[model samples]
Target chain A: ENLYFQGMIKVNVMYPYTEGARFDHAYYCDRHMPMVKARLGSACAYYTVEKGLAGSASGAPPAFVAMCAFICDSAENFYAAMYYHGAEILGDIANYTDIAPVLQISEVVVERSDR
Target chain B: FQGMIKVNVMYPYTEGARFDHAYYCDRHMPMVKARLGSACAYYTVEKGLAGSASGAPPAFVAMCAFICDSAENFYAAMYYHGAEILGDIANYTDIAPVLQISEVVVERSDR
Candidate 1:
């Protein structure tokens, strides 16, 4: 089956910010993400990171400061990796930011073709 | 080269907003893909479940990702089809979707 139609699970971790909160993007990209892949291993097929710019309305800041997603084959694969290293991975948050990330598990319903 | 620009359109649930998932995923997205073509490198639609870390309600009811080669290309394509697409929203949900234009720093997959 094409990657477009495959039923993949996306684990989205979002950092919702309030005034004065800290998020170290350099540490997130340089250190934390690598550790994510290293611990999650093959279960994590791929990942993406985003630094929020703004919200929808004029002069409104973004609700989330930064976000990341890990795409995996299935929920089982993601859970297996998480079950094994959940503590360490979760604990590493202190190294990057103060905000406790909000998480979501989404089943990719539709993905358009690359072309 | 990260020429890729990703647009994340999120439908955050209001107290009692109507969100037609079928219309969004089936009717709306296909139309978006058809119009945007290659300008849309790819897109993914997700239905929100409970917040994974906290037991709180999902911040959004639904969200979609539109990946394009560049912001210029995407806006150009959108400019041509903006009216038709924007009007189509009423067929699904009343909630105004929050949009974020992002620079894709990384992406990977086994396939």
Candidate 2:
């Protein structure tokens, strides 16, 4: 594993594909994510929003509708961001989709430096 | 003008599932990175601490996001090295992998 990202924290917010799940990708990319970063400010080193297009096999529906990963230098930084903005962040969920998001906090094991 | 692609590999959590985070983080991913070379721009391996319901067990035990320059570039790279990569799966886990290809619609960094 790359040592540079070995200890970083990754907060993965996954939206499991529920039957008839509804998600507004436009709002997620444009409005929701912007507000999220703005709310977290520098606590979030960077983040990426994913729109699941395909699965492991051809023509398979993606297992997850969307995934948002928020990276932080440390877990404390992430906690602070949430402590301050949790309410708004949690409340905003309804605006984007109906599927309940699955959340996980992970340690980054390998990350290439350039991109 | 197309955006970057992120290949997400998710390992769902189920009863009696076996996943070795150590092996994946230490051996498999590093080897895969070397094989893919620069086509894989960067990767993030997540060792899930909790589950889906926010309070429920995590949906995936370990997930990997591999960011690549483009979909075609990723496909070509995988085509050459996929066998080498897939062969290593048995060394890491028993659970069937859940994979997805996605377009990173928005990505940004502070500072």
Candidate 3:
């Protein structure tokens, strides 16, 4: 039997500290993400959220936060397609927000059956 | 078809209460899909609007992807009742979400 493979990716998008809390996430959830979903399709992207590695201080987080995914025949396929469309997708960020976005790539190694 | 199934979130906090927006992603999603004989699966993430959290999010958010042979299989295999498997990660941190949003994945046309 063949197995259907899934891929995962998270972007370290740090936004300007000045933006008010809740407004940022609200904007992304309300505005920016919808645009990305429209272009790349939400199915391809599984989940998206915000954060940077935590520390013991209270300050502005990253300018932005995010995560994305794609379905492919294999891990290599996932990477190739990611880099291919990723080039254009990254450019689209400017249209959504003035802040620049950066991403860190990783593959899923474990998952929980019961959600 | 490929779809995202279970997502566990963890927002770690060094001090005070933090919402661990933790979820499984990457190979794990696929692994579960395989276990249940899922044919397809997908995972995604995006930056919340600038300044979405009370403070900065713990650091990262993730999701789990799985592919069931059919939509029914997907549901049947992925039935989660709160408070059952919920305690597994209790030691990690506290988790509180704003809301739960689920949408069908239509218009997935890739070349």
Q: What TM-score does structure 1 among the candidates reach?
A: 0.83
Residue by residue across B17-69, what tens digits does model 2's lDDT show?
Answer: 78888999888988888888878887777776664335667677888878888
If you assessed candidate 2 against the hidden native complex, which CAPRI class would it receive? medium
Return whichever of 1 and 3 wins on lDDT: 1
Q: Is candidate 1 or candidate 3 better by TM-score?
A: 1
Restricting to chain A, the TM-score for each candidate equals: 0.89, 0.87, 0.46
Candidate 1: which stretches are off by over 4 Å?
Answer: A1-7, A57-60, B14-16, B53-56, B109-111
Candidate numbers sorted by DockQ from highest down:
2, 1, 3
Superposed by TM-score, candidate 1 places the C-alpha of residue B8 at a distance from the truth, in angstroms, of: 0.5
DockQ of 2: 0.59
What TM-score, computed on C-alpha atoms, does each candidate reach? 0.83, 0.82, 0.34
Q: Tens-digit lDDT track for model 1 on A1-115?
A: 5666346777889888677788888999889988998888888778888777666565667777888888777777787888899999999999878898878877667744443
DockQ of each: 0.55, 0.59, 0.05
lDDT at residue A17 of model 1 (Cα atoms): 62
Among all windows of 10 consecutive residues in model 2 chain A, the one with the lowest summed lDDT is A106-115
Task: Give the C-alpha interface root-mean-square deviation per candidate.
Answer: 2.2, 2.1, 11.2
Q: Which segments of candidate 2 are over 4 A away from where they belong?
A: A1-7, A18-20, A113-115, B14-16, B52-56
